[PDB]
Design an enzyme around this catalytic site. Structure first.
Site, PDB file in Angstrom:
ATOM      1  N   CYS A 140       0.920  -1.209  -0.079  1.00  0.00           N
ATOM      2  CA  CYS A 140      -0.050   0.123  -0.009  1.00  0.00           C
ATOM      3  C   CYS A 140       0.908   1.164   0.246  1.00  0.00           C
ATOM      4  O   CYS A 140       1.453   1.599   1.008  1.00  0.00           O
ATOM      5  CB  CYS A 140      -1.208  -0.031   1.370  1.00  0.00           C
ATOM      6  SG  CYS A 140      -2.154   1.358   0.927  1.00  0.00           S
ATOM      7  N   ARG A 181      -0.470   4.653   2.938  1.00  0.00           N
ATOM      8  CA  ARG A 181      -0.368   4.073   4.446  1.00  0.00           C
ATOM      9  C   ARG A 181      -0.394   5.486   5.422  1.00  0.00           C
ATOM     10  O   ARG A 181      -0.354   5.195   6.598  1.00  0.00           O
ATOM     11  CB  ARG A 181       0.452   2.976   4.694  1.00  0.00           C
ATOM     12  CG  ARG A 181       0.239   1.852   4.253  1.00  0.00           C
ATOM     13  CD  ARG A 181       1.101   0.508   4.675  1.00  0.00           C
ATOM     14  NE  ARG A 181       2.085   0.513   3.786  1.00  0.00           N
ATOM     15  CZ  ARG A 181       3.404  -0.083   3.901  1.00  0.00           C
ATOM     16  NH1 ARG A 181       3.594  -0.512   5.131  1.00  0.00           N
ATOM     17  NH2 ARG A 181       4.430  -0.305   2.758  1.00  0.00           N
TER      18      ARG A 181
HETATM   19  C1  HEM Z   1      -6.816   6.134   1.387  1.00  0.00           C
HETATM   20  C2  HEM Z   1      -6.162   5.964   0.439  1.00  0.00           C
HETATM   21  C3  HEM Z   1      -5.641   4.729  -0.113  1.00  0.00           C
HETATM   22  C4  HEM Z   1      -4.732   4.832  -1.133  1.00  0.00           C
HETATM   23  C5  HEM Z   1      -4.592   6.081  -2.422  1.00  0.00           C
HETATM   24  C6  HEM Z   1      -4.105   3.446  -1.480  1.00  0.00           C
HETATM   25  C7  HEM Z   1      -3.310   3.239  -2.262  1.00  0.00           C
HETATM   26  C8  HEM Z   1      -2.890   1.867  -2.694  1.00  0.00           C
HETATM   27  C9  HEM Z   1      -2.622   1.540  -4.116  1.00  0.00           C
HETATM   28  C10 HEM Z   1      -1.917   2.461  -5.126  1.00  0.00           C
HETATM   29  C11 HEM Z   1      -2.373   0.176  -4.093  1.00  0.00           C
HETATM   30  C12 HEM Z   1      -1.840  -0.570  -5.088  1.00  0.00           C
HETATM   31  C13 HEM Z   1      -3.080  -1.258  -5.903  1.00  0.00           C
HETATM   32  C14 HEM Z   1      -2.568  -1.842  -7.173  1.00  0.00           C
HETATM   33  O1  HEM Z   1      -1.643  -1.787  -7.977  1.00  0.00           O
HETATM   34  O2  HEM Z   1      -3.893  -2.654  -7.579  1.00  0.00           O
HETATM   35  C15 HEM Z   1      -2.593  -0.112  -2.819  1.00  0.00           C
HETATM   36  C16 HEM Z   1      -2.491  -1.681  -2.375  1.00  0.00           C
HETATM   37  C17 HEM Z   1      -3.168  -1.789  -1.152  1.00  0.00           C
HETATM   38  N1  HEM Z   1      -3.756  -0.940  -0.319  1.00  0.00           N
HETATM   39 FE1  HEM Z   1      -4.116   0.884  -0.236  1.00  0.00          FE
HETATM   40  N2  HEM Z   1      -4.583   2.653  -0.389  1.00  0.00           N
HETATM   41  C18 HEM Z   1      -5.592   3.415   0.451  1.00  0.00           C
HETATM   42  C19 HEM Z   1      -6.279   3.005   1.331  1.00  0.00           C
HETATM   43  C20 HEM Z   1      -6.061   1.696   1.848  1.00  0.00           C
HETATM   44  C21 HEM Z   1      -6.957   1.237   2.746  1.00  0.00           C
HETATM   45  C22 HEM Z   1      -7.789   1.770   3.487  1.00  0.00           C
HETATM   46  C23 HEM Z   1      -6.683  -0.154   3.036  1.00  0.00           C
HETATM   47  C24 HEM Z   1      -6.955  -1.201   3.949  1.00  0.00           C
HETATM   48  C25 HEM Z   1      -7.694  -0.856   4.988  1.00  0.00           C
HETATM   49  C26 HEM Z   1      -5.475  -0.627   2.158  1.00  0.00           C
HETATM   50  C27 HEM Z   1      -5.015  -1.509   1.914  1.00  0.00           C
HETATM   51  C28 HEM Z   1      -4.254  -1.820   0.776  1.00  0.00           C
HETATM   52  C29 HEM Z   1      -3.962  -3.307   0.333  1.00  0.00           C
HETATM   53  C30 HEM Z   1      -4.160  -4.384   1.459  1.00  0.00           C
HETATM   54  C31 HEM Z   1      -3.234  -3.253  -0.738  1.00  0.00           C
HETATM   55  C32 HEM Z   1      -2.812  -4.399  -1.589  1.00  0.00           C
HETATM   56  C33 HEM Z   1      -3.699  -5.051  -2.445  1.00  0.00           C
HETATM   57  C34 HEM Z   1      -3.372  -6.477  -3.198  1.00  0.00           C
HETATM   58  O3  HEM Z   1      -2.413  -7.081  -2.562  1.00  0.00           O
HETATM   59  O4  HEM Z   1      -3.678  -6.753  -4.011  1.00  0.00           O
HETATM   60  N3  HEM Z   1      -5.177   0.639   1.540  1.00  0.00           N
HETATM   61  N4  HEM Z   1      -3.087   1.003  -1.999  1.00  0.00           N
END
Ligand code: HEM
Ligand code: HEM
Ligand SMILES: Cc1cc(N)nc(CCc2cccc([C@H](N)Cc3cc(C)cc(N)n3)c2)c1
Ligand SMILES: Cc1cc(N)nc(CCc2cccc([C@H](N)Cc3cc(C)cc(N)n3)c2)c1
Ligand SMILES: C[C@H](O)[C@H](O)[C@H]1CNc2nc(N)[nH]c(=O)c2N1
Ligand SMILES: C[C@H](O)[C@H](O)[C@H]1CNc2nc(N)[nH]c(=O)c2N1
Ligand SMILES: [Zn+2]
Lengths: 403, 404
Positions: A107, A110
């Site tokens: 992520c 974060r």
């Molecule tokens: C608040 C704004 C947020 C932004 C801008 C953001 C941004 C991102 C981005 C760009 C990715 C890569 C996604 C991809 O290439 O498909 C990602 C992955 C991820 N984010 Fe976020 N994130 C946010 C919030 C969150 C929240 C709220 C959670 C969990 C509570 C979270 C958990 C994750 C996880 C687990 C991944 C990995 C997904 C996977 O393995 O397929 N993120 N995030």
């Protein structure tokens, strides 16, 4: 050995000591690195993850050793000894979900980890109830374009039965309809799920952006189909600030990125249905979803509308078109007053995050290949930052599709 | 089923297993506990062991494993090591090992070309003056008036007690970096240290953004000596843009020949401390990293202003637009001047093909994803979508500590 972690732009050095707290092996060995792979190739054990997690929690609120900490450890011991499992208190669940996000190495968002709205849906006993919960989540998280991060947590896995699950990988997904002529209409990433929806009774559309129904499943039942009320599903028409033809391409994307097929692990308990949402970074939509060859793959079309020489790579038609398309996404989201962050702002904020985490915990597990954006990598500060990757718990984990 | 890593391409959905990684005899920096893949930089019976493996590798590449010439060459090598501590490569062995080090380089995207290396054997070289001549010859051959040819020149191996042959410069062509009385840098900030050294050792500096540096060459147990390359040997390309007519007025330029001079080539335990090698550029090296890195020439803002972009806000993608146009200027100016260059699309497309060839030929290819994927337009190139396994095989090019 505590690894040395250098930023090659600024020449600055840290040491990751947080990696010592990993209890869960990743895919790499001294003989070969597999950090670019997408997927990884008793009751004493539950009890020690539970203890470790309860310690995390009392430490988090500064009451380590207190009566309440010692009594709460006994509660857990007592419950595991007698039942082979236990339950978390709402406050614990909330701390666990925040820490799962914080720990997620892939992520880039974060810095927001502490601002997470946790809905407790563990009092859920049917697919119908799950739907009502999922709808209130959407309403809340969407907030008329002023998006707000959120998770809803459904009942945990139990030895004696099947899991609660959301078959969809995200809450909002566009259908992909396979053609007799081999090709896909719509999002090719979602052909399998589209077909499952049809087979469990859905009447399909035939557009490029038909929002899909949910397949929600309560334990040991066939999944059930629920259509989302369109007014809950905020979408953004894509236009470009200077190129008027662009709007004519009819492109669009939804406001809400809500992952719905990952397992949430807290204190060794597992939450198979625990969907979570934030807001999009533009490159996810503008670069991957629209420009990947195995997605909407709109790059030629755009480059032809821009009258670019498509016949050779060396004109950089691909690169020019991708930039415009990312621009369209940012412009259209701004115009529609829906939250978006571009990859420069996002990665700037992630560097600030590494720095907060260095002071607070002595490291930040991070996956370089997912943190660096899919266009303009070396243009962002994270390209130049070394990063260490490892698995802390609480954690979001991939899980197998339930069919 | 196979207990070799499974490698998947997510664009095409195809799968392979790397079996080659089993031949790695040298641990990298990762462990089950934490992955360190993104970090830039983390004898006796031992030599005899490395040399036997390399000779075995040689004999398989010519299809004579177990043959009589094979068992005799093994015997020769233990004999030589027994009586002297070291041994020496046959000419055709050096040619093979040099190519195999290139083929083994996880960070090189240009490896489809690996079979075509020209190997200049310079193991007879006995002074710094002679290193200079060999180096000049390398540059003339490799540059070839803009029709670039891959090549390496190999100087005498490390020897016990006697000091090393060493080229102090990290590349054969490098622009000067002059530290200013404020604190900024004129020229290439990457090269401040070697600039200062050249000056300490007697070089008379210029004061341009693009002053070609001289060479500090070091023969055994001697202080390094300084050699100015004659300008006519150093082909440069002035940069202009196909349609943005003002771009030429910026006076930017780059040299044609990318030639690494400070890496150690290791074959069969033998250590070649001076063995410079050269190919041709991928446009992103010049137009994205060298010209646009904040800590390099850092010209992105300047170009963006010329292009009239809104530089006060990230969400204009002003950086992305300027970078694209700089990369295009690089491709365009090299093409106009008939100097070989390859764009990031063609390079990566070529490397996928290499991966397929190497699957068939060796059962895998060691590859470093963070380096193979280009620094602009990552996911627009097919390598982004291809998983890669990284490991160390030998022969190898290895980083070595600066000699000073
Ligand atoms: C608040 C704004 C947020 C932004 C801008 C953001 C941004 C991102 C981005 C760009 C990715 C890569 C996604 C991809 O290439 O498909 C990602 C992955 C991820 N984010 Fe976020 N994130 C946010 C919030 C969150 C929240 C709220 C959670 C969990 C509570 C979270 C958990 C994750 C996880 C687990 C991944 C990995 C997904 C996977 O393995 O397929 N993120 N995030
Ligand atoms: C023929 C055309 C070639 C192209 C287009 C090419 C392309 C590249 C590129 C783009 C890099 C990454 C460099 C960076 O990010 O600064 C690289 C690294 C490298 N290539 Fe090549 N290459 C070529 C030929 C060669 C040859 C002839 C050799 C050796 C015989 C070689 C050995 C290497 C090595 C060792 C690296 C890693 C350098 C390091 O760790 O600093 N390549 N190559
Ligand atoms: C909260 C949030 C914010 C934000 N800006 N973006 C997102 C994007 C999430 C997402 C969406 C689709 C596909 C994947 C992932 N590509 C899905 C996936 C597939 C497989 C096989 C493995 C694996 N680890 N992951 C991940 C989420
Ligand atoms: C033959 C060839 C062809 C081609 N197209 N490109 C090149 C690029 C050469 C190069 C130049 C400057 C810096 C580095 C590398 N950045 C130099 C470097 C520094 C450190 C600390 C570690 C490490 N592994 N490397 C590598 C070579
Ligand atoms: C093989 C490679 O790991 C895979 O293509 C990854 C690369 N980096 C990524 N980074 C993000 N943020 N999202 C992705 O889907 C991917 N895909
Ligand atoms: C921190 C990170 O390892 C570093 O910036 C790497 C990333 N990928 C790279 N890739 C190439 N080809 N060249 C480089 O110098 C780098 N730098
Ligand atoms: Zn690794």
């Amino acid at each position: 050995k505590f690894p040395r972690v250098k930023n090659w732009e600024l020449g600055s050095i840290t040491y990751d000591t947080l990696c010592a707290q990993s209890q869960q092996d990743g895919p790499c060995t001294p003989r070969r690195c597999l950090g670019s792979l997408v997927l990884p190739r008793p009751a004493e054990q539950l009890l020690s993850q539970a203890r470790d997690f309860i310690n995390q929690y009392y430490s988090s609120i500064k009451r380590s050793g207190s009566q309440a900490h010692e009594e709460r450890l006994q509660e857990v011991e007592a419950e595991v000894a007698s039942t082979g499992t236990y339950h978390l208190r709402e406050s614990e669940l909330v701390f666990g979900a925040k820490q799962a996000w914080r720990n997620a190495p892939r992520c880039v968002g974060r810095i927001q980890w502490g601002k997470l709205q946790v809905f407790d849906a563990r009092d859920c006993s049917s697919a119908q109830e799950m739907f009502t919960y999922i709808c209130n989540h959407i309403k809340y998280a969407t907030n008329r374009g002023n998006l707000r991060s959120a998770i809803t947590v459904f009942p945990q896995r139990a030895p004696g039965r099947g899991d609660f699950r959301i078959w969809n990988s995200q809450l909002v997904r566009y259908a992909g309809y396979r053609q007799q002529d081999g090709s896909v209409r719509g999002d090719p990433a979602n052909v399998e799920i589209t077909e499952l929806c049809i087979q469990h009774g859905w009447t399909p559309g035939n557009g490029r952006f038909d929002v899909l129904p949910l397949l929600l499943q309560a334990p040991d039942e066939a999944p059930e189909l629920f259509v989302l009320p369109p007014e809950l599903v905020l979408e953004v028409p894509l236009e470009h600030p200077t190129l008027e033809w662009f709007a004519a391409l009819g492109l669009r994307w939804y406001a809400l990125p809500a992952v719905s097929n990952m397992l949430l692990e807290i204190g060794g308990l597992e939450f198979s249905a625990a969907p979570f949402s934030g807001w999009y970074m533009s490159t996810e939509i503008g670069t991957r979803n629209l420009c990947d060859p195995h997605r909407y793959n709109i790059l030629e079309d755009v480059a032809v509308c821009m009258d670019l020489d498509t016949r050779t790579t060396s004109s950089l038609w691909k690169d020019k078109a991708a930039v415009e398309i990312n621009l369209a996404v940012l412009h259209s989201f701004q115009l529609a007053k829906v939250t978006i962050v571009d990859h420069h702002a996002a990665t700037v904020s992630f560097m600030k995050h590494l720095d907060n985490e260095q002071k607070a915990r002595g490291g930040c597990p991070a996956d370089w290949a997912w943190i660096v954006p899919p266009i303009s990598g070396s243009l962002t500060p994270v390209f130049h930052q070394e990063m260490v990757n490892y698995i802390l718990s609480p954690a979001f984990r991939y899980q197998p599709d339930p069919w």
